[model samples]
Target: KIEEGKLVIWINGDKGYNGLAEVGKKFEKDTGIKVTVEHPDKLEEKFPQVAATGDGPDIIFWAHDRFGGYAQSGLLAEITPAAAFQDKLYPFTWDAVRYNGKLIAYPIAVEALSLIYNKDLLPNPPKTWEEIPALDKELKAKGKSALMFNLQEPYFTWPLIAADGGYAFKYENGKYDIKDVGVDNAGAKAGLTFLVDLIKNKHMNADTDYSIAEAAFNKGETAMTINGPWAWSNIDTSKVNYGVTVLPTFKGQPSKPFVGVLSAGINAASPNKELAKEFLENYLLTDEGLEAVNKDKPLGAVALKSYEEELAKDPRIAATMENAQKGEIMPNIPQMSAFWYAVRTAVINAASGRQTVDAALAAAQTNAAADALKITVSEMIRDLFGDSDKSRKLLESINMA
Candidate 1:
């Protein structure tokens, strides 16, 4: 009954349109509300700044990690999920969207890594970490790498740490104990030891940056890689026959990759919150709406369970779903900013043999703790006084540990 003149959404990512033409038009037709989807270059930088000023779009489409910051800044509207919302979604989808016990977004998709292999090079993908070394030796005879990933990048390295029970923080008494970083712990040491040996044995190398690794895979120089769908888009499958599967286990433990969810959250200050919520619920969540979004080899595994059978039919979707089910959700917290740079340095240094794995991780643990404290204190400033330039200045003024 309520017809807004327009509903606007800001989306990040180089992927244009992303089925919004069909979905937006459907939204417009169904509700008599015209839809506007804007793609700002560097959306991660642009969104928070504009949203803080209350001049942002009605909806912001992004990864759930940003939800905690936005919700903390008073930029996001709290959503009480209707029963259908809870019933139709995967369990962790709810957990991902909530920040500080308040639901903040409608989770749309989940992205996770899988063991993508060259079908011709390896008819059977390895099932355990021990198998990788043998495969590495075979490929080395041909002057090729067995499995090359960005060793310096923390996101790519997390599965090894996770498989060995290393984690960012311990969840105790229903709260993440930020002080208790597991990066320097026993599991992390074991995981990094295994990874470093791969480098030393010539099975992998630090020179294999993202572009080099992808080029190697595309040219069939590498037998397999641990990557996600985004990498899958670049491979010319016509030239390189491929298969996707779960990552091999580490010793006897499962190598669970990190799962990231992309979602749309309402701008708390938007006049069109009702329209945004209605559109998300009635249009985006529908079978027809999702079918459109799921186009172009579909973006990650859509959150709806109704599409499970349909998604499994596509090999890419099936592989990612398998990983997502087994993986840990990326934490949507302010502390995550601390984890990235800290772990990234540790992984790079350890992989490059610049430092012992234990020493590298110990440094990361100390650095991340300091970073978390600083960022969290800044969050407190924004909360005490709404997101304002003055508050930001005040936050910066406070000397942090």
Candidate 2:
């Protein structure tokens, strides 16, 4: 039987919780169902266990990337938004929550990498990689670098790797072809080679990690850096005069960063499933609901197109949304685990001069392909034998344990 008079939702951050909690109050007033919002620690670790045992919240708020695992494990209930509602949102937001052709969540907001520049230092951000050399010369005279970011992190550097036509995987007919890894393709090599040249020419530092890059930018030591919306709070606190814009082009081709959507979903085992769905569709998805949420934690890119004009009043939000629309959604497949590990290692090796770009990326492609294949085979084994001891024995026999 459906639970009456109450609904529970789990969100990680205090700002997000407070935002949704505002809408929850409205939902309660209209439907007479009390909505309880929780900020739980280690939600990613705790959710699966409690959801499996039917003790989880009615709704789960999280990043779309993690939802693939939940949807695959049957912890998320399938969501079917009205066609009218679907038309109101950016088409790519739906792509974030879909798993095997089924919608598993509602997109709340979107985010992507953008060029955040120290306005006082650069005045104008570089428009292309070709322009960076001139800016580097100018900044060098001023005792500063042209740009810096976490050199070894794939998430931060993927735009450079992809700007010349590289991609992590091929997406066609509404699904990713994980087998078609393209990180080491000629275009990708061109992109990485550009970075290697920058490092060798001393235009950018090879030793800059996330903290180093962020500190340098905040302290006005670097003219520009690539970062996402989540960094805004700290940047604002640092009080640096800055501006956000789309990343520079590479060889006349635009850089494409990975788009990430924050989303909300119903717990599959929730007793208040219908009420939870009602709250989402009736109140949470409303213009007022989204506005309230954005007020609490300013959204970088809103999923609803109707909200764009209002949010774009802030130039920073406008720039991020522009980049997000031009980018591909981050792959939410289980195979991405292998892709991340392989690419990060490759990036670190190539950036640190431990290996040539060709050697590093070729090794990444080979290792990622092998690991993704193993994951696919392991999934097949589990599907065939279930999760019993039989599955364990079969995996062990195949050296996949």
Candidate 3:
């Protein structure tokens, strides 16, 4: 069952660095177990299929977003770290990997969006949204825009919608109540209106996407952007003097962005479960191990308390940690997919003048509710009937197969 001293780990795309491979070498030397780390394309799609057949890798390294679905589908093994280990990690990092009160993954790194501004342009970033208009007017006179971001991206725009109490779902008792959709609430409407107005008033560009916004900021053509640590490399190489800070408040209320954690999950179906857990806990979770990981790919924020002092030396990381502390851990429920899809559509419709803000958000609320219901019902059916012929027949009858 231990797979004869062999372990396999899958990381999605090119994000995998030599750090894990270095740890794998040391682990092999210590435990006499061969560790193979693979950077597989389309791991998000391929993992589930292979795992269902009991032929998946021993472990997977990816964002915590998919762990809820993986855990619910019986693909992930619950990982209960010792109290001593748990004490070292940030509480919110654990929040990201927990599904229904069970730990489904090991937290590795944390990230959240914050305001990144050109110090050469603004000197000091605005403290509130109300100040943006006047700043925009001043910047316009200098032939520059005040701000720009991906107009239709729900992840990028979440802080705005949440500024006045709007939320994707009501989280209570440490769980998300999917039934309480809040995207169309009055507060959310106000936020959406403000965003659309920024475009209509020529303060921001409607055509901006993540790449365009990052490019403009890197070139010092824009004053500010809402982004995360991933943009640091390019911004640094561009030689643009920049500063990182918490996002400005909206109407006297603080805007809370979504915080995301990258984590490592064990495959429940793997024969090497014990060995995989040992590798993670004894070899990969140590201070030495984390230092190696960060050396190859800089962590946005270290989840381990021991690394806080080290990470704080970088002002950008320090500011990002502050923003993350004030933000909400992104909901890891399977229904979050529906929320993202619905909200993205709503933002596009409202921002492009295809629909009024009220109409767009209302439709998104209805669509999200219906989609979440479908996901819930489908999960119930699978739990009841599994993948038997009868289950397929029932799904085909309902056009859900």
Candidate 4:
């Protein structure tokens, strides 16, 4: 009975998409074990805010960086080194899972942005954000692609900016501190403004919520796109042979993505801790399972020993492995949730020509600062007036809506 043969894995929207469901079913059939992959969109959609509200998943499938916000608030179960499964992990991989002083997640995979392009259409990847605009110009002259990466999503544009050393927030002294915001920051402004110019020049595709960036490249609408190893599985390789590399150093630096970590974390409240640990050990971590995951995802393994051999077999994984050397740990500060959206607003505003990169970023900076301070003041008020519903109403009467 202790081995409760089923696992309720609550994950992001990914599990249900693109034959992932078919894969899950196959695993269950082959192993006589049931791995129910729950695509809890609302969970990923609201996890940051939900964790703040004191409710979150049992064993969440998310990046280790996500622990930053949850750890700051004591929202996660600590599976520090002394914990049962801790030593089996790679230290650097574990590093991404640490927030404040606690290690709360087990990393499963790492992902970052790189040049993903149709090789037949264009022989080489662009080396920088600066190169992209010019490359687009070349393509525009020939009716090929300018360049694109889901322009509507803030997450995609971020790597282009980050590749230039631009950042949304800085983590310091056990808290995330927003610093050097505004297009006034040369790198940030250059990155955003470039995108603005691209949109104006018709280099980028229209705004998109889907994986339109990759679609553009693969469908032959565009010659190139910025992407990460995660997209490898979905790529139609025969239709269009592709190449991968680090994002070009536009604005004078490479485009570094907010790396996504696939992590395995224990749930303190889970009744199946031992079995869960066993699953992490046997099915997911065994040489075979680990190899399968790393191969399928093909980004390189978290464990050091697994890399060389995998690269020898499938060199595509080599591309990601080689580039992983340049990947940085994405920040998990709580304020980032607000900061990213605000930053996105600023970038998109600039791209749309609604504001100068300077004005757009200045507005974002102000919004982020005010939001952080407001959270601090609200927490203080809550501490002073514990459990008083009336207090909020009294304050709200005078507070601006």
Candidate 5:
């Protein structure tokens, strides 16, 4: 319900940063509402603690569901105007912005997915994981090495499964019941089989640790992979004639990308609350406002419902925008925090061949479920101790109804 002026913001200095920096400057220019975006990655630890003490930034842009501790403690204020946000965004993305029936956040872009390939090596890229092996074979027959993406992280892993109609989780009615952590689901097993076989028997290089994969990809060690648009800047696009494709299809279904919308939410305790809201709703939401975002920081945009015609001109924008419609806006559930850590654990286990694909992933699901339970139980225990002790003061003062 609050709007803006002199709002404090915190963000990471990734491509998302540059995109938002432009928004901040233009926002200030038009509204005279000074937008301060601080990029102290270390703020992950320090700032939240300060905020919990009522000294937090007026606005913060970070993953929503993952930061449960602060929100759970009532330090993070609940958001309103749900209809404005939920009705406007892509469905999956709209779903991720909700928490306990409230719109706690806003999105900027989907976890933007696009292809990274050597155009010269692959005159035509494979459209599905099923086609990758055959393409590798064709390259071998031509006395050239075939290409494959490095599954060094979730960003790489999610698309392959998405290409095969798999999802990290699913939603029905209104909530994510989490019946399927797709890596263990039958379809996801099939997806990973494609992934593992590609690495062990076909073209993808072995998992060499994610931090090293980018360097390897840039050095031309990787023939091709699926990644977001930023790779164009970090990798040597000029050295190799490369092309990007939307991660391909399975059964004619578009690949399920992890769409991330870079949104800024105002702190309920912010000093210039109303101005912040006005700045967000007007200047940042309009077409002219978005143009500065598109032109300057320009990784990708999510509210394309407004600019469909303009987005079609660039292949990269077109691809990402297309994928955004089909992509999965990752859930912003508190339980999902446990899911990511467990998933990383599963990825390592499967990559090592330490266990069966089913077993590794199932174990991760089981452990994540237990971890989520622990979070719940621990909070309950904390309540029992803190409330019982704190309430004793009130109980002595008055009789309850």
Candidate 6:
């Protein structure tokens, strides 16, 4: 393994930008090795291109979803940590930061949406989805809404879908069965009906967005809102004492949200490769270092199981932990890129009451299937005809233009 030297770090601006920069300062202080952090606004879009060139920053911090393409393209370094460290994080998160069984990154945080309720407004929060209507009635007596969230967005809408038994794709035999797309099924439509019911009954605003939800909660205009830990930073907690907890269930089943793990990984090709891995694994992931990174703003559920209890003393972090531990990892495959818009449209239509729940869900299913086919066919063409001029000409004659 290579030894100490200057290292380049790409910090995703989405969440840990400031936190990683703080850790970088500490690493430099302790090791006398210079640390450079790149927190570019477009790191997600640009890093893949950087990876394709086989040269870039020494390390990059990003969500697990895009790691599959980097690993498949031979751009990510395989991380083999100490045996004890392997078991330190939640099993679900540990499993997510990999590609085809190869550990591709140092896991950092798990993000999942949950219920954030003001303790002052509601002495007790609803324990299940079935109890929400009663809570809404109680809150109305106090002249406040019971819950609010960005009903127009898919990420927030997914938990309800899962509660109703909808899923983007099914996993089997250790791989995602893309052909088993479940968005259009009876369960999915049922999920849409659940959400539409919430809208129709006025438990939430049909026009809500992140800003509206955050503002309503912060100003104490609403008692509860479903959101992730990252959104907590925007809430003025001093104005409203809040408690976080897992989302309530539909019937008796738990609402399953999508869990996102943000992690740091070394570039396969780097000038100071050894130093990069050393900083990431040995230094940055340490107890003290993680605390420093998260001190700027908490990052949902810290992946290390041992340190989690200490972090969870805060009700907000505790709520995040409860929900994230039960949530499913968002699929990390490259083709997952093709499925977002359909889900968003389904949520918008369902929440707005513009279409029946079944109609909205069917549209989402059809749209996702079409998008999947388009992506699959494009990849097939690239691999099958790129090397042969005759085949390429045939593709063009068929209006491949």
Clashes of each: 0, 0, 0, 9, 19, 0
Each prediction's Cα lDDT score? 0.79, 0.83, 0.83, 0.62, 0.62, 0.76
Give the per-residue Cα lDDT of candidate 6 at 179: 68
Candidate 4 C-alpha lDDT tens digits along 1-401 = 11255565666553222233344455567666566656565555465555455444445666665566555455556663454455565677777777656667767666666667777778877666666667877787877875767766666777666655566666568555654343246777777777787777776644644466666676787776766666676675537777776666765665656676777666554555555555555456545556555445454445434543444555555556555556556766555555666787887678777888889888887887766555456556667886588658644653344
lDDT string for model 3 (1-401, tens) is 32545999987543435778888989989988899889787686688788887777899987787788788778999986889879988897888898888999999888788999999999999998878878999998999988877775788888888888778889999668889999999999998899889878878766778778988888988999998776676677799999989899887888888787879999897777788888887788777877777766566887887875677789888788788777788888888867888999989888888999999999999989887777777677877999888877776665352
Q: For model 1, which pairs clash? A: none
- For residue 164, model 2's alpha carbon misses the true position, in angstroms, by 1.6
lDDT of 1 by residue, 76-142 (tens): 8897678867798787788899887789999987888888899988899889888888988887898
Candidate 6: the clashing residue pairs are none
lDDT of 4: 0.62
**Which tens-of-lDDT digit does each residue in 215-257 have in candidate 5?**
6556655556666655565654447667767777765666777
Provide the lDDT at 49 for model 4. Answer: 58
Residue-by-residue lDDT tens digits, candidate 6, 222-241: 88888877777666545578
Displacement of residue 254 (Cα, Å) in model 3 is 0.6
Worst 10 residues of 6 by lDDT: 392-401
Off by over 4 Å in 6: 1-16, 30-58, 73-75, 80-92, 130-143, 232-239, 267-272, 312-318, 352-356, 373-401
- Tens digits of per-residue lDDT for model 2, 1-401: 22555998898652446878999999878888899999787686588788877678889987787788777667999987889879888887888888888999998788788999998998878899889988899989989989998886687888888888778778899778979998899998998888888988888878888889989999999999998776776678799999999899998888988777888889888778788878887787777888787666666777887776567688888788788777778888867767877888988888889999999999999988887777677779998989989988877776453
Residue ranges of candidate 2 with Cα displaced over 4 Å = 1-62, 80-92, 233-239, 267-284, 312-314, 382-389, 396-401
Candidate 4: RMSD to truth = 4.5
**Residue runs of model 5 more than 4 Å from their true location after superposition:** 1-7, 26-36, 40-56, 63-75, 79-95, 134-150, 162-166, 178-183, 206-221, 230-242, 249-254, 304-309, 324-327, 353-356, 375-401
